[PDB]
Amino acid sequence: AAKEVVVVSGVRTAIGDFGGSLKDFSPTDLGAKVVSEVLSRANVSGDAVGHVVFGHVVNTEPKDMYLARVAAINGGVAQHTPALTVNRLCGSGLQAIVSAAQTIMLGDADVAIGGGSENMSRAPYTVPSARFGQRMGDAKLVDMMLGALHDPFQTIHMGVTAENVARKYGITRDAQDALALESHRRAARAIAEGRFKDQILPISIRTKKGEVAFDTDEHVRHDAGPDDFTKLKPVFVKEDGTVTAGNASGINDAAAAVLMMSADAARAQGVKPLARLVAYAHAGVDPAYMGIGPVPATQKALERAGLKITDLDVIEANEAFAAQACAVTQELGLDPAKVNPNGSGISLGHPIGATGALITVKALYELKRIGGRYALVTMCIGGGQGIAAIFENI
Amino acid sequence: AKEVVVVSGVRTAIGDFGGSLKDFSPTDLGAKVVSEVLSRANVSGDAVGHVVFGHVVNTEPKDMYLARVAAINGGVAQHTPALTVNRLCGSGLQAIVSAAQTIMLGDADVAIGGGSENMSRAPYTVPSARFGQRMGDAKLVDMMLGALHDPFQTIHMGVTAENVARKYGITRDAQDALALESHRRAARAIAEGRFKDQILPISIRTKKGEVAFDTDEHVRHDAGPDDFTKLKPVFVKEDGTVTAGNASGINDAAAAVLMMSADAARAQGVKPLARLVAYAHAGVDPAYMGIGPVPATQKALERAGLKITDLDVIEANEAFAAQACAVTQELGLDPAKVNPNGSGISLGHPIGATGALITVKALYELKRIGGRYALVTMCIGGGQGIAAIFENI
Amino acid sequence: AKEVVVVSGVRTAIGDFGGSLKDFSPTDLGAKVVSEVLSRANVSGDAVGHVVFGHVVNTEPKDMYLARVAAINGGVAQHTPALTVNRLCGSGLQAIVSAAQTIMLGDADVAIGGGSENMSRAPYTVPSARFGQRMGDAKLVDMMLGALHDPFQTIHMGVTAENVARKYGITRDAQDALALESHRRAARAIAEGRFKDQILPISIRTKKGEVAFDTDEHVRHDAGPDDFTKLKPVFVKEDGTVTAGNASGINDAAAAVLMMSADAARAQGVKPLARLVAYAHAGVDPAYMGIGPVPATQKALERAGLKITDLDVIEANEAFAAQACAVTQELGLDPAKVNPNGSGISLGHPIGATGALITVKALYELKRIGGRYALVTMCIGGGQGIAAIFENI
Amino acid sequence: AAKEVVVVSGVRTAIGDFGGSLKDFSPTDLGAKVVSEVLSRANVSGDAVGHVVFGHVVNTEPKDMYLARVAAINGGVAQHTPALTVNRLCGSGLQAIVSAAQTIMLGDADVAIGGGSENMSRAPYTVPSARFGQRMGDAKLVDMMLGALHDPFQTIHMGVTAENVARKYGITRDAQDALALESHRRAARAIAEGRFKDQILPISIRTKKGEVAFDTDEHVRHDAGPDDFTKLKPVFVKEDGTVTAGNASGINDAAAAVLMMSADAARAQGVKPLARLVAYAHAGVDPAYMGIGPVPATQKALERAGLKITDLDVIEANEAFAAQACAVTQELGLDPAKVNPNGSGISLGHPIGATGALITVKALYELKRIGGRYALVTMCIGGGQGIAAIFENI
C-alpha cells in the first residue's frame, strides 16, 4: 500500500505587496530562505533530503528555470538531492506539496520538501521581436504578469471569469464586499493577537535607515469598514460589474515550504510533527468558471479521506475573488466562520505560486492553535482547475 | 503500485533553431501531439485522468498554461487536470514519470505525458521595464542563453561538458568520433524510414505552397570526419575540446505518450507499445551535470532487478559528445546499443521535449528489433540525471 | 551681405535600407565627407569658421553631437563651432543655407555645410523604460516610421502624397511614367559615369574581401513600365495611386560642400564650383506637404531676379512621384531639365542628407553641361519647402 | 548693413525636477505653450510670424523630430510659417534665438520666434538591436539621457570634463560648494520676492486632488546651508574628486521663448520691448575642457559689441558645474555679485535645450528689475563649444 506522509515542519515569509517590501528579493532567494528554515525547524540535515519540489509560475530571470534546484542548493540541501519545479498556476504551491508527498508515498524518498515561491513585483516584460527583429513598425513589450492573469482560451482577465461565477451562482456585490471586509478584519485580529508569529520567517530588509525586520503581512488594511468597499467601482467589465480592486485578491511576493517524511522515518527520529496528509484530489472545470474548481476537488478529496464537510475544523480556501470564494463556500455548504478564520488572498495577498504552500502552513498552524483535527486546503486555478488536500493534526 | 502500460506515442520531427517549426508556438505543438496520441490509442478525450507536460522556456503568457492549453486544444475534455513540470533537460521524461505516478497511485486510469519546446521562440526579457531603470543602460536578457547557463557559477553548459571531458578522459578525437557516427546512424535511420511511424508530419506554410515537415533537419547526410576536426572549441578559449559539431543543437519539437493502468488497457483491447518497469533520479555536482545519467541509471537498474547487459535499447541523450562518451564509459555500455539511430548531436535537443521524444524513439526501436528492455536517460543542467526502463510487450 | 561661393562638394553613394552602408554610423559618414571636402578644396582644417550638418533620426547618443563629431573626426580643428539642424527632409539644404548665413553676416570666412543620415540604423525607443510601465503591455516605438508620419494627423507621408495627387490631377499613369524615367536617367547617368567625380567611394568590409561601394544601389538597371504598373497602392487601401515603385526609398548617405566668402576664395586661388544666388523657405498645409517646393521656388526666383526659364538645372527631390509631378506641373518646369539623372525614386532619399546631396548633383551637372543657373528644392514633412539657386562659375 | 533685432516679448515655464512636476508634459506640448504666450505678450498675431526656431537635444518621441513645427502650429502660428529645430547641445536654446535673429538681420523675416524646449524626465531608452535582431546573447537598452551627457570623443561624463577644468584652473571644492550654496540662496530670495512672477507662464498640473498651478522652480533648496554641500561625496571620479551632486546642475524639464522683430516693424507697431540684440559669438574648445567655452565666446562677443566686461550690468552664465562656472568667472574677471544674481543651473536646474532661451528671459527681466543697460548671456556646450550674446535694455 501507499506510505503515510507526515508533515513535520512548515514556514512562510510574510507576504509583500506589489512593488512593496520584498520587491528586491528574487524567487530563488526567497525559496532558499524557506528551505533553510524548514530544515532547521524539522531538525533535519541538508544531507538527508530525498526530493525537493517547488511551485512557481512567472520566471523573472534565467535562474528561475532552475528554481527548485537553486532554492535547494542555496538553502543548504546537498547536491545529491533531486529538485523539480512545477507549474499548476495558482495551485502550484499545493501541487508542489502533493508532488513531494507522492515521492514519499511511492517509497522513492523518506524525506521531501514541498514549497512555493513567487515574486510578482519582479515579473518581467518580454519582447518577442527582439531575437529576430521587427524590421519596421511598432512592436510590443509583453507584460508577463498580466499575461499570466489572462485565461489563455478566451484571453480575458481572471477577473472576468470571477464575474461569470458571481452571475451563475448568484453572488451579489454586497456579499462579495461583506466577505472582503471580514477577511481584512480577521487578518488584522490575527496580526494583533500574534497568531502568525511562529509560522513566519522574518526577512531583514536593507533600508537606508538601517536593517528592519519584515515579519508582517503588509496588504492588510487594519482600519477597514464597509464604505471602503462600497465606494469602489467594478474593474473588469463595463456593464453590471461586481468585482472590484477591493474584493479581489492582491498580487504579491512570498515563499513558503513544508518538510515531510515517511511515517516510519518520523517515528524513528522522534519528531513532534504538524500533521499527516490524509488525501488530495484534483479537478478541471470550464476555464470560464475556473473560480468554482475547489468544489469538485474538495468533494473528491473528502470521498478519498472517508470524511464529510462537517468533520473539517479548519478550511483554507484561497480568496482569489470574493465572487468565487463565496460561491465555493455556498456550493460546498461550508460554515463561513471556519473558512479562512484569519483572512486569505483578499487581505493577506495572493503570491501565486507560493500561495498554496503558504496556506497549507496557515491551516496546519491554525489546527494547533485551536486543537482541531482536520483541515482542508483548496484553491481555484486559472485555465479551469481545482486542487484540494486534507491534513490531520497529530 | 499499479502497472503502467504505454499504449501509444508520437513526436514531431525536430526543427532547427530558426527553422521549419519557428512559427509554431509550444502550446500549438503540444496540442498537435496530444490529439494524435489520443487517436493512435483510440481513446476518447473524455477518458483522460491527467495530462503532464515538460517545458522549460516560456515564450509567451500562454506557455505558463502549457499543459492545460495543449490538453484542451488537443481535444482533452476540460474536466482533466493538467500540469506543467520543469526539470530542465529531463522535463520531457519527468512529465512521463509524473503522469505514470498518477496511475501507480490509482488517481487515474489514463494519463498523457509529454514535452514541448520552441527555442527559436525563446524571448528576451527586460527586468527593469516594470518599475523602470531611471538612469544608466539596462539589459535585454536572452532567456534561451540564460536557460543554457548553470545558475551557480554562471557558466555555459558547455563548460560543464569540458569539466566532464577532463575528469573522465574523453579526448577531442573520441568526441568527434561519436559526433560523426551519431550523424551517420541518423541519416541511415532516416533513409531506411525508421522514424516514419513515430513522426507526426506538420504542414508548414511556404510561399512555394503547402509542404510537409516530417524529417529531422539537423542531420548532415554527407558527413565525414573532416567536418568535425576542422571546427575548434567554443566554450573555453584554450585547452578546449567541445565544439559546435560535437555538441547538440538547440531545437524545436514536441512529443507525447498515452498510458493506462494494466486493467484499463486490457479492458479496451488496445495493443500497447511497452510497460514501465522502473525509474530513478539523481543529483550530482552542477559543474559535472553531464554525468548525471550514470547514478540515475544504476539506481533504476537496481529497482528493476536488471543489469546493463539486459538492456537491448539505450536512448541516452547526447547533450555533448564530451558527456555522452563518459556516460557510456562509466556505465560499461555497448556503443552499438546506445543511440542506434543518433541522438542530440545529429537529431537535435529541443530541451523540454527531448526526454519524451527519446522515450518515443526507444519504444519504437524495441518493436523494430524485437527487443525486451529499453533504457531512457539524460543529463540535466544544474546537476541531475533521470532514467527510466521500459519492457516491450 | 557678402557673396558666398561653393568651392568644393562631395557625396557618398546612396545605400539601400539594410544595405551596403548599414554598418556606418551617421557620424562616421559625416566625418568621411568632411575630410574629403576639405581636401578637395585644399583647405586646412584649422581654417574653418563653422560646420553645420542636417540630420533627422538619432541612431545613438553620439548623433546628438553629429556636426561636432563629424567635424572633429573629419579633421576640423576643435576651435570651430559646429551645429546640427533638423528641418526634416530639407535638413541637408538647410545646413548649407545656415552655413552660408555665417559667411553672409561676416561671422566666418569658411564654412562647411552637409547632411548625414542612416535610416538602416534608425532605432526603436521604449518611452516607458525610464520610470516603468508597471502594468499592461508597453510599446516599442519605431523611430524611423515615426519620422515618416505627419505629427498632426498621424498619417504616413504617403497619404499626403495621395492628397497632392487628388488636388493636382496626378494620375497613377503619370506617376509610374515619372518613376520609370527616373530610373532610366539614373542607370544612364551611372553608365556614362556622371556621378564618378562627385562620389566618395567607401570600402565596405565583406567576407569576400575588400570591396569599394561607389554606385547608388537603389537603381533598377533593367526597368520597364511593367515593373511599376504591376505594383499597387500601399498608403490608402481603396482609391489609391502611390505604390512602393513610384515612391522614393529610405536610404543611408552623407554629403557636404565647403564654402567661402568671395574675398577668401580669391585670395586662396581655389577654382570654385558655383556661387549662392538666393534661397527661400515656405510653409504649406501639412496634409499637402509635397507641394512645399512651389512657393519656395517662386520666392527664391523673386529674390534672385530670375524666372523659371533661366534655370538650366533643377534638382527637385522626388519624395513621391505624386508630389514631384505636381511640383513640375504647378511651376511650369521642363521635365527635361528636372532631375536629368534621376532623383529620390531611383537614387534614394537618405532624408537629412538628401538636400546636401542633391545640391552636389546640381552643381556637377552645371559643370557637365556648361549651364549657368541651378535650382535645388524639396518638400518637407510637416508642411514646408526649401529652395536655393546657384550660379555656375 | 544688418538689420537691428528687437526682442519684444519673452516667457519661460517654471523648471521641473527630473521625474517631477512636468514629467507628463511632452517637449512639443511645452513648446506650444510658450509659443502661444509669447505671441500674446507681444500682441502679435499668429498669422504674422516669419520664422520659428527651437532648440532641442533629446528626442523623446517621433513628434520631437518635428519639434519647432509642432510647437509653432499648436501654439497658434499659421501654417505658412517656416519652423526649424536646432541642436547645439546645452547651447541650443540660445542658438535658436541667434538663428531666429539671423533671419531678421538678413531681411528674410520681420518677426521670428526663438525658443527651446526639453523634457529630460521623458528622455527615452533605445534598443539598437530591435530592428534587425540580436539573434543570441544579451543586448542593451541604451539610456539616451546619460548618453547625451557623455562626451562623444572620450566617452566620459560631462562631470569628468568639469573635473578637468577645476584642476587646470585651480577651482577648489570649497569654492565650488560656496558657489553652489550661494546659488540656492539667491534663487530662494528671488522666489520669495517674486522676481520671477512676470516671466513665468504657470502650468496647470492635473493632480488627483484637482488642478494646481505649477509656477515655481522646484529644484531650489530654500533651507540650504554649507554642510548640505560639505557632507556630499564626489560623483564622477574615484580619486581627488571635487564635483558632487550638490555642486553640479540638475537635469530638468522646461521650455522658454522670445519673440523678436526688426527694429522697423517694432517701431511701426509701437511695441514696448524688452531689449535689442547687440552681438553674439561662438567658440569651440578642447572637448575635455568644454566647461570653459564661455570665455572665448564672451571675449569675441564683447569685441563685436565694442564693449568691455565692466559695461555688463547683468550676466547669465549657466552654472552647468560650479567647477566650470567658477573658472569662467575667474578667467573673464567678472564680479560674482553680478553673475547669476538670482541663481542658475545648480539651484534652478538645467533643462538642456531650453536652458539658453530660458536664461535669456531671466537676463532681460533682471535688466528691467534694476534699470540696467547691458546683459551677457553665455553657456558652455558639451563636445567643447561656447556661445554668448549681449542684449541692451531699451
Author numbering:
A (entry chain A), D (entry chain A): 6 to 399
B (entry chain B), C (entry chain B): 7 to 399
Q: Which passages does the manuscript contain on this structure?
A:
In 2020, Tan et al. discovered that BktB from Cupriavidus necator is a polyketoacyl-CoA thiolase and demonstrated its activity to produce polyketides, including TAL, through repetitive non-decarboxylative Claisen condensations with acetyl-CoA as both precursor and extension unit in vitro and in vivo in E. coli. One candidate, BktBbr from Burkholderia sp. RF2-non_BP3, exhibits approximately 30-fold higher activity in vitro and supports 30-fold higher TAL titers in Escherichia coli compared to the original enzyme. Additionally, we resolve the high-resolution X-ray structure of BktBbr with three different substrates: acetyl-CoA, acetoacetyl-CoA, and butyryl-CoA.
BktBbr has a special loop region that stabilizes the tetrameric structure. Deleting this loop region eliminated >95% TAL production. Comparing the apo structure with the structures covalently bound by CoA esters, no obvious structural changes were observed. High-resolution X-ray structures of the apo enzyme and enzyme bound to various CoA substrates allowed us to perform rational mutagenesis and generate mutants that were more productive when expressed in E. coli. The tunnel architecture in BktBbr appears optimized to facilitate substrate positioning and product release, which may underlie its superior kcat and in vivo product titer compared to BktBcn.
